[PDB]
Amino acid sequence: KVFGRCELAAAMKRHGLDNYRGYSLGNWVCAAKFESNFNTQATNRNTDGSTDYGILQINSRWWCNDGRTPGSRNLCNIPCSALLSSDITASVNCAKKIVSDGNGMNAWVAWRNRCKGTDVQAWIRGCRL
Numbered sequence: 001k002v003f004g005r006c007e008l009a010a011a012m013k014r015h016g017l018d019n020y021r022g023y024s025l026g027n028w029v030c031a032a033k034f035e036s037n038f039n040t041q042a043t044n045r046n047t048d049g050s051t052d053y054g055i056l057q058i059n060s061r062w063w064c065n066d067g068r069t070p071g072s073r074n075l076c077n078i079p080c081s082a083l084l085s086s087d088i089t090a091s092v093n094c095a096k097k098i099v100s101d102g103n104g105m106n107a108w109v110a111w112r113n114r115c116k117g118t119d120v121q122a123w124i125r126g127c128r129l
Contacts (some may be wrong), residue, residue: 001039001040001041001086002037002038002039002040003032003038003039003040003055004038005029005033005038005123005124005127006124006126006127006128006129008029008032008038008055008088009025009029009123009124009127009129010127010128010129011088011092012025012028012029012032012088012092013025013129015088015089015092015093016092016096017092017095017096018129020096020099021099021100021104023099023104023105024120024121025124025129026119026120026121026122026123026124027105027111027115027120028056028095029120029123029124030111030114030115030118030120030123031056031105031108031110031111031115032055032056033123034110034111034114034115035052035055035056035057035108035110035111036054036055036056036057038055039055040054040055040083040084040085040086040088040091041054041084042054042055042057042084043084044057046059046061048061049069049070050069050072051066051068051069051080053066053080053081053083053084054080054083054084054085054088054091055083055088055091056091056095056108057108057110058076058080058083058091058094058095058098060072060080061073062074062075063075063076063078063094063097063098064076064078064079064080064082064083064094065078065079065080066079066080066081067079075097076090076093076094076097078090078094
């Protein structure tokens, strides 16, 4: 599913991401736009041969099992396919694990390079939340 900007904001809010670890909702939306362009089905192979899955491009090296990432871990204890669902519940619960991991939203390279330092609140402008 390809979410609308405000549609994803609302879903991320309902699921508890807003100010989760002090990251406002616009950070989570901004990251989603620049990781997946809001498309739940988005998949990208990493040079290390891991793959990133879903709305927040969660990575099979550490967070989910895709059955083909050698010597990966699966710290969110899920199949990576779970993360491409139009139900973002797994993507969001796993992302909470990731952000709590010590490096915050810097675990997300698109967030680090495209959202951090910017007025991320623009990404939820116009949304009824």
